[PDB]
Every structure is written in C-alpha cells, then in structure tokens.
Amino acid sequence: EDDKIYRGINNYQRKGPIRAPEHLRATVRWD
Amino acid sequence: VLKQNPFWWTHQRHDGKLWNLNNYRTDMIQALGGVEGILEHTLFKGTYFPTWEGLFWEKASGFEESMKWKKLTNAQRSGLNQIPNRRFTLWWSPTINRANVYVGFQVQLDL
Amino acid sequence: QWENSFVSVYSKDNPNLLFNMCGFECRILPKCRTSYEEFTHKDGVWNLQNEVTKER
Amino acid sequence: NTQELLDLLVKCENKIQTRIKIGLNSKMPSRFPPVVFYTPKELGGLGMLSMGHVLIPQSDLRWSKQTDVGITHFRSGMSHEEDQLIPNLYRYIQPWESEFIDSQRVWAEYA
Amino acid sequence: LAKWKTAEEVAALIRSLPVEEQPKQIIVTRKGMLDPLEVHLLDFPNIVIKGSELQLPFQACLKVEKFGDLILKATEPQMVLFNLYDDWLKTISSYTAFSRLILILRALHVNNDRAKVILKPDKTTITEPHHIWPTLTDEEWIKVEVQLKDLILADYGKKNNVNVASL
Amino acid sequence: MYNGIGLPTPRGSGTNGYVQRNLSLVRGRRGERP
Amino acid sequence: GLAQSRQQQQNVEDAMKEMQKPLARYIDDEDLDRMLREQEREGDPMANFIKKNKAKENKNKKVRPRYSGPAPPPNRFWPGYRWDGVDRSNGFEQKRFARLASKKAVEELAYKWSVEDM
Amino acid sequence: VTIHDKTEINLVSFRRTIYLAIQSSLDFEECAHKLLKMEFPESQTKELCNMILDCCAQQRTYEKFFGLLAGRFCMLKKEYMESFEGIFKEQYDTIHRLETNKLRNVAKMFAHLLYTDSLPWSVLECIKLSEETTTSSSRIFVKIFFQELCEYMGLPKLNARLKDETLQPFFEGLLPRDNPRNTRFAINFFTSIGLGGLTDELRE
RNA sequence: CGCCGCCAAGGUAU
C-alpha cells in the first residue's frame, strides 16, 4: 500500500498501439 | 414553422438558464486525458504546435449572412456541405487509417 | 372520450394514487399504509410534506 | 426510475454510433474508437453526451411485474469496458427537488 | 572527486529505471563531466551527453522550504522523486509549464525576496501538501508571469544600468 | 442465465449482455467460497 | 496624503510576508484557521446575542469623524467619502458602468455568434 | 538504486477515479457497485470516504444522491461508518475554510445521514455549543444543520430522538446545564435558528 | 453470463 518505490510512470496505481503481425507483408495495390 | 422545438416549456430570457453543464466537458477531458487526441491526430504535421492551447477552429464565414447573391440551382443549395465531412475525416487520419487492424489489402494512390 | 381518458382511485382497497401529467406520470403512496417504510432517499422518489405541521 | 427508457437510449445511442460508422464504411470498434466521439468541439470532434455508460439496472423478471423488489443484478451498457469511465450527463445537472429547495430559500433571503 | 562520484550513481539510476523511461540525450551544466559520463555510460552507448547554453537555477530550488528541509536533514542517500508540474498538465501543456517554471526559478534566483512575495499575491493563496506551487486562476497565473519577467528585466537594468524599454 | 434473467436479443440492442451482481446488497450470509 | 500611508502599509505587509513567512502558505498556517474563525459568515443567529445594535463609533481612518449612513453612488475606486458627498455628478460613472456591462454581455453573445455552425 | 516518491500521484490518481466512477453511473446503487468492484484496499478507506465527502461538497445545489451512496457504504461494511464518522468530527472542528456553499452542502450531507441513520447518533460529542468558543461559520454550519434536519424528523420526532434516548448525555450541544451562560446561550441560539423545540428553565 | 469486424451499382455523360 503505497511503498513509494514508484516503479515508473504508469505504475502509480493490449489496447492502444497494437502490435503489427511480424509474419506478414501487407498486400499492396496501386490505386 | 417546421422546426420542432424540444424547448416548448422554457426560453432563457424569462425563467433563466435552468442548467449549467460546463464541468462535464472538463471531466470528459480528465477522464480521457489532456492528450486525448494529440497522440491520435497528427498535430505534428499541422504546424510546429508545441502549445495546443492557442488552437482555434472554423470561423471564416460560418453564418454567411448574404453569401454573394448567386443562383444556387439544385445541389449547392439543398445538398450537404462536403468540406466539414472531409476535414473531420482528415482530422482523425492516423486512427481512421491505422495499419494494424486489417493488415491485408492496402491501396496506395498515385505518387 | 373514454379511450383517451384515465381514472384512478385511492381507497381502502386501492393503496395507491396514480396519475399522469404533462408528459410524465407519478403516484402518491402514503406513509400510513406502509408496514415497512420505503427507502425514499436514493432516486427519483421525492417526498411530500405538510406545511402546517412541517412533517413529511 | 424508467428502465425501458434507459434501454431505449442505449439502443439508439449505439444506433447513431453505427450510423456514423457506416458513413465511413468501417464499423470497427478498434479502428474507429469512441475517443472520436467523446471530445468537445473546442478541441475538435463531434461532441456528444454519454448515457449508455450508466450501467443500466435489471430485476428478477419473475417478480418484476409483481412487486417492487429493490435493486439487484446490474447490467452493463455499452461494449466499452477498458476502464476509461466516460461520465454521465445527469451528475452535472442540478435535480428538481434541489432546485426547488434552493429556490425557496434564495427568494426568501432575496426578499 | 564529486565529478567522478556522481556518474556512478547516475548510471545506477539508469540501470534501476525501466527501458522506455531511460533518456536518449542528457543536457548537463557547464562542462566538467563529458569524459566521466562517457566512461561511465559504457553499458548504455546510445545516450548523448551535451553541454548547451540553457543553464537553469536549480540552486534557487534550494531556496524553497520543502526541498530545503529535505536537503538539510538526511541521514541516507534517499534518492527522492518529486514533481514540479503539479496540476498544470490537465490545463496547459509542458511547453507553457517550462516557460513558466524557468521564469519563476530565474526570478527566485536573482531576487528571492520579491519573487517570494509575488507568488502569494493575496491572503487566500493556499497550497495543498502534495504540491509545492499555489493554486490560483489563469489570469493571475499570467499576471504573476508578467510581474516576474518584469522583476528579471528590472534586476538586469539595475545590475548593468540598461534601459529596459531600449532592449 | 445464472438464476433467472439475461437478454434474449443481444443483436437487437446496442449491448453485449453480462449482467453483473449487485455488490451493494445487505444481508446475513451470501458467500459460498469462504 | 493617504497614498504614502498605503505605501507604508503595503511595505510593512511586504516585510512581514517576506522576512518571517515561507514561500508557500498551507491550509493551517497558524493565520488562516484564525481568519476562518474570524469570518463574517452570514446566517449566524449568534450575532444579536453579543451585539446590541449597529451603532456609530469613531469609525474613520483618522481621528476626525465620518459622514453618516445614507447611500452614496459607487465610483469604481472605493473612497474615503466624508463631509457631505451628496450624489452630484455629470453621469460618467453610470455611463461607463453600463458600457462595461454591455461589453461583458456582447462578448457573451459574440462567443455564441462565433460558435454557431462549429 | 531504489527511489522514494514524495510526489503523491498514487493518492491523487486514486482520488481522480472515484471522482469519476461517481461522475459516470447515475443513481447511487451503481456508484457503490463500481466502487466496490475496484477492490479498494483498506488503507485507502479514510480517503475514499473523504472523497465522497468532498465531491458532494461541490455541486451547486445539494443532491440527495450523496447521502445515499454515502449511507449505503456507511452501513455496508463496519469500517465505512467508523472512518466516515471520523470525517465528521474532523469536519466540524474546522469548517471555517469552505464557507457559504460547501458548508451548506456538507451540513445537509450529515443531517441526511443522521436522519436516515446509518451513522451513530453520537457524532455530536464534538459539537461544542458555547457562543464564546463557537465561531461564525461554525455557528451557521450547525444552524442549517438542525434547521435542515428539522423537517425530515419533524420537530417532535426530532425533539424526542434528540433527548429521549436516555444514554444521550454524550454531548455538549444541548445538555450544557453548566454555568448560566452557555446554558442561556443554547436557548437563545435555538430560538434564533427558529426551532425552540427544546427550551427549559434552569434559572431556578 | 461479455453483441458487434462491409463489398459494389448510386457521378464526372453516349
């Protein structure tokens, strides 16, 4: 209960930037 | 006149503003963070805007009393205006166009 | 006309006085015919008081 | 108190959400978030007022038509549960009886 | 020897903090530590050490009382972690916060007296214990900013006998 | 449906379901795990 | 005659706020919880228990007496009104007070007029 | 290698989302639900109850919703009533800071709890009726307090429950049967506040 | 107790 070692910014108490599939190129088309 | 009024029971200059919703907007900001759109919208290629508090929106001829007395034949009179619907889509551009929800068919334009 | 009218009654058999008004309907339930009194401080519930004796 | 209108607001709010989604031809929760909606016009966006994130109540359906049972079995509203806590409008609107009890003493002290 | 004793604890701070929070660039004060930081940051090669022309009066941070009683009464290298942007990020950015903070710190550096009395303009300028700055409205925020930059310009014009309006 | 209620049409309304339990209830004995 | 007295008062308040008090004042402060107990705080039935009537003592900045209690017009700068100041003027205070109130009204309507189609 | 944090962002970041859970979520059954469901550890309970106090203190005109959420806790777990009462005794004995509004919202806040109970009837041992030692905003704190508690209980049902409880003599509010000063000052006060529902003759 | 995942004809005439 509030040990004030504080652990970093977001730790005071998978969404957002989602990980790209590493095993994939996006199928590109020339519009 | 055909505009249906949801305010048949009041008007402000005799019984007053019976509600002042002002802090709901501020608590919406504090619930979604003060950077609620800056991480999403490209403010960085807007200009070099470091402050984002002096930012101001559409003011140029919004009411448009007498435009210039042209004819306004069919579609430019009664049809909807396309430029707010495209500037709003331009405003949330990296989070209407994000690369990693459907990572399949992408269609780059010419040049 | 009968179909667009609405009659209701509070008596010894009906413990409740219900009526509609001006778009939204309400009802009076007295304190005297409650075995256990309702909570009456949590929602759209607001109480009525007698001004001659200050009690609800 | 009216549960059937709290259901109707949740039904129609997500319906106008979907109507704005089909204007972009996206219909996606992750590509097209509700961060786009709940942002004021002064910072940019559309600007709307939440009543779906109110956690609409339920009751025992066997005894709902029979007897006032109290309050049991909260039901979720919108499909947004990542703990952003978008506030409700009514918590920043002054109620009826508070306004009347304030108005009586305000006019009494004014006289 | 303090220039060599500092960089070891700085590198221990870099090792203690997580990966996304360690810096890519460090702007030090006047140069005596480019080669000690260069030989102490061998475990983290991608950190740039630069000495710029932006000196900042953190010695004026020793003039405030919550830092002053903490720096004078200590029996351990406690390594405390405080915050100077108290409640500004909810209303303004970090840009206006920095442009306010360095002006108030420079005003406290050149004259602690009138920069101390300016930050309490009335007798209703209370400060909550978890913050160090007072809580006041935006008009008197920019009013305090204007009178503290007037303090700094007046101290410059008194020191070097320079007309303030002629600059 | 744990005991009595749920939603017969999750595709009609703009919700997904998952009725919770009222943690603000007051009675004597309710637990089964301790 | 009194502006230098005001300068002396603000300098002695300046000295007591600088040479003895810290940079930030807290909630307690050993001064503010005294002032909060010494507030007016209207809505107090105990006012007539200790006070007889709103009498007129020698309540003045100097030793000399002060004008009585009718209502003088306001003049934007709260004065030392005494010795028979009975409401004679050309009408410049009321005109610019109405001007500044009208300015505060038309900025409110101008924000409305600007925010219409946004 | 280890830090200390003398910035409390663990506190205020907590105090933000119970300003928020109860900003969202209409009525009081849902606010309590959401608050429970966040499993707040016990250390923080004094601060939670204090934040429920605070948030209520600032809404324009008072909303009965807070003496309902507040009560729902205040009789739910044993702790909330204890912590919460501590907030009262703590509260009156300052009450000179906030004034003329928050003072009213908080006063009615407590009157509402007492009336709906879910709070021991002896919180009043701290209220010191003096007229020497009461100060202003204290005095019109307790004014709107009783005067506003008046009609809920009505005068008689208050008059009794104030006194009839036998064990009542925990307080200095009314019972100061002491020197003919603060005794006379009680009578005068409650007659001025316009209740006079209890006045006696101790003057022999 | 945990909905929902979108293409095209509709316009730059024959």
3-state SS string over E78-89?
CCEECCCCCCCC
Residue B107's alpha-carbon distances to A26, A28, A29, B91, B101, in angstroms, are 10, 6, 5, 20, 15
d(CA B15, nearest CA chain G) in Å: 18
Tokens of E155: 């101290």
Residue from D90, D22, D82, D7 nearest D52 by CA: D7
Residues with Cβ within 8 Å of E138's Cβ and at least 6 positions away in sequence, in order, are: E91
DSSP E strand stretches across C1-56: 17-19, 26-28
Residue found by looking up tokens 């009690």 in the block: C55
Q: Any chain H CB within 8 A of the CB of D88?
A: yes
Q: Which of H158, H161, H189, H160 is nearest to H173 (CA)?
A: H189
| Contact residues, chain H, for B30 at CB < 8 Å | 16, 20
CB contact set of B63 (below 8 Å; sequence gap of 6+): G113, G116, G117
Nearest to H128 by CA among H157, H89, H99, H98: H89
If you count them, how many residues does chain E have?
Answer: 167
Q: CA–CA separation, D75 vs F21, rounded Å?
A: 8
What is the DSSP secondary structure assignment for residue B80, as one 8-state letter? P
The identity of residue B97, as a single letter, is N
Rounded Cα gap, residues D15 and D11, in angstroms: 6
Of all nucleotides, the one whose C1′ comes closest to residue D28's CA is I5
Q: How far apart are CA G87 and CA G77, in angstroms?
A: 15
The distance of A20 to chain D (nearest Cα, Å) reads 14
For residue A27, the cross-strand partners are B105
d(CA A31, CA G1) in angstroms, rounded, equals 84
Element (H, E) at H155: helix H137-163
Nucleotides of I under 7 A from a protein CB: 1-8
Burial of E83 (0-12, 13-18, 19+ CB in 10 A): middle
Residue owning tokens 């003895």: G20
Query: Among H146, H143, H58, which residue's Cα sits nearest to residue H106?
Result: H58
Q: Which of A18, A21, A27 has its CB closest to that of B105?
A: A27
Interatomic separation, CA of residue D34 and C1' of nucleotide I4, rounded (Å)? 14
Backbone angles phi, psi at E50, to 5 degrees: -140, 140
Q: Three-state DSSP class for C27?
A: strand
User: Could F22 and H75 be called an inter-chain contact, meaning their C-beta atoms sit closer than 8 Å?
Assistant: no
Measured CA to CA, the distance from residue H50 to residue H180 in angstroms comes to 38
d(CA E32, CA E3): 7
Name D residues 80-109 whose Cβ lies under 7 Å from strand I.
Answer: 81
Listing DSSP states for chain F in one string gives: --SS---S-TTTSS----B---TT---S---S--
Question: How far apart are alpha carbons E37 and E3 in whole angstroms?
Answer: 9
Tokens of E74: 């200590």
Per CB-CB distance under 8 Å, the chain F contacts of D60 are 4-5
Count other C-beta atoms under 10 Å from residue H181's C-beta. 12
Q: 3-class SS at H164?
A: coil
**Helix, strand, coil percent content, chain G, rounded in steps of 5:** 40, 0, 60
Which residue do the tokens 């007798």 mark?
Answer: E123
Contacts of residue B48, Cβ cutoff 8 Å, sequence gap at least 6: none
User: Per DSSP, what are the bridge partners of residue B107?
Assistant: A29
User: Of the candidates H27, D90, H55, which has an alpha carbon nearest to the alpha carbon of residue B24?
Assistant: D90
Q: Quickly give H13 CA vs I8 C1' distance in Å.
A: 50
The reply to whether D11 has its C-beta less than 7 Å from any atom of strand I is no
> φ and ψ at H44, to 5 degrees?
-90, 0
DSSP G26: -
Amino acid letter for position D41: K
Q: Which of residues 27-66 of D touch strand I (CB under 7 A)?
A: 27-29
Residue with tokens 């009494």: D108
Does an interface of 3+ CB pairs under 8 Å exist between C and D? yes
For helices H137-163 and H78-92, angle between their N-to-C axes, nearest 10 degrees: 130
Give the C-alpha separation, B82 to B88, whole Å. 10
Cβ separation B18–D99 shorter than 8 A: yes
Tokens linked to A29? 């088309």
Work out the number of other CB atoms within 10 angstroms of the CB of residue H145. 23
Name the closest residue on chain H to residue E70, using Cα atoms.
H6
Question: Which letter does DSSP use for residue H4 in this model?
Answer: E
Total count of residues recorded for chain H: 204
Give the CA dihedral E68, E74, E77, E83, nearest 10 degrees.
-30
Residue of A nearest to D82 (CA): A15
Q: Report the amino acid identity of residue E167.
A: L
User: D93 CB near a chain H CB, below 8 Å?
Assistant: no
Among the listed residues D44, E84, E99, E142, the one whose alpha carbon sits nearest the alpha carbon of residue B51: E99
Entry resolution in angstroms? 4.5
Sign of CA dihedral G21, G26, G31, G35: positive
Nearest-CA residue to the C1' of I6? D25
C1' (I1) to CA (E16) span, angstroms? 44
Task: Pick the residue from chain H with its C-alpha nearest to E10.
Answer: H1
Cβ contact H14:H20 at 8 Å: no
Q: What does the alpha-carbon distance between residue D88 and residue D86 come to, in Å, rounded to a whole number?
A: 7
Nearest to H103 by CA among H47, H143, H158, H147: H143
| 3-class secondary structure, E46 | coil
How many Å apart are CA C8 and CA C18, to the nearest integer? 6
H167 at the E interface (CB within 8 A)? no
**Mind spelling out the 3-state secondary structure of H170-201?**
CCECCCCCCCCCHHHHHHHHHHHCCCCCCCCC
Report CA-CA distances (Å) from G54 to E74, G48, G57, H6, H189: 57, 10, 10, 52, 20
Alpha-carbon distance of A31 to B109, in angstroms, equals 5
* Chains touching E (3+ CB pairs < 8 Å): A, B, G, H
C-beta pairs of B86-94 under 8 Å, 24+ apart in sequence: B88/D46, B89/D24, B91/B41, B91/D44, B91/D45, B92/B37, B92/B40, B92/B41, B92/D36, B93/B41, B93/B42, B94/B40, B94/B41, B94/B42
Other beta carbons within 10 angstroms of residue D72's beta carbon come to 17
Distance CA H74, CA E72 (A): 44
Residue H136 and residue G41: Cα distance in Å, rounded?
Answer: 6
The total of other beta-carbon atoms located within 10 Å of residue G56's CB is 10
Q: What is the CA radius of gyration of chain F?
A: 14
Half-sphere exposure of G116 (CA within 13 A, CB side): 11
- Structure determination method: cryo-EM
Please list, in sequence order, all residues whose beta carbon lies within 8 angstroms of the beta carbon of residue F19, skipping any fewer than 6 positions away: D58, D73, D74, D75, D76, F5, F6, F7
SS3 string, D15-83, reads: HHHHHHHHHHCCCCCCCCCCCCCCCCCCCCCCCCCCCCCCCCCECCHHHHCCCCCCCECCECCCCCCCC
Buried b (16+ CB within 10 A) or exposed e, H113-132: bbbbebbeeebbebbbbbbe
CA distance H169 to H190: 18
Task: Return the exposure string of B83-110: e unless at least 16 CB atoms fall within 10 Å of the residue's CB, then b.
Answer: eeeeeeeebbeebbebeeeeeeeeeeee
CA dist., res. B24 & res. C48, Å (int): 31
H41/H77 Cα distance (integer angstroms): 13
Would you tell me which residues 1-31 of chain A have a C-beta closer than 8 angstroms to some C-beta of chain D?
15, 18
Residues in CB range of H12: below 8 A, 6 or more apart: E130
Closest-CA residue to H139 (of H95, H171, H197) = H95
Kindly state the tokens that stand for H83: 């912590």
Task: In whole angstroms, give the CA distance from residue F18 to residue E160.
Answer: 74
Q: How far apart (Å, rounded) are the C-alpha atoms in residues E95 and B53?
A: 10
Residues 6+ apart with CB under 8 A from C48: C28, C56
Q: Which residues contact E33 (CB under 8 A, 6 or more apart)?
A: E3, E6, E7, E49
Nearest-10 Cα torsion for E32, E36, E42, E48: 0
SS3 E58: coil
Contacts of D24 (CB under 8 A, 6+ apart): B89, B96, D32
Q: What is Dmax (Cα atoms) for chain C? A: 41
| Environment class of G66 (CB within 10 Å of its CB; exposed 0-12, middle 13-18, buried 19+) | middle
Token look-up 């000690």 returns E36
Cα–Cα distance, G74 to G71 (Å, whole number): 9
Q: Which nucleotide is nearest to D22 (CA to C1')?
A: I6
- The span from the CA of E47 to the CA of E25, in Å, is 5
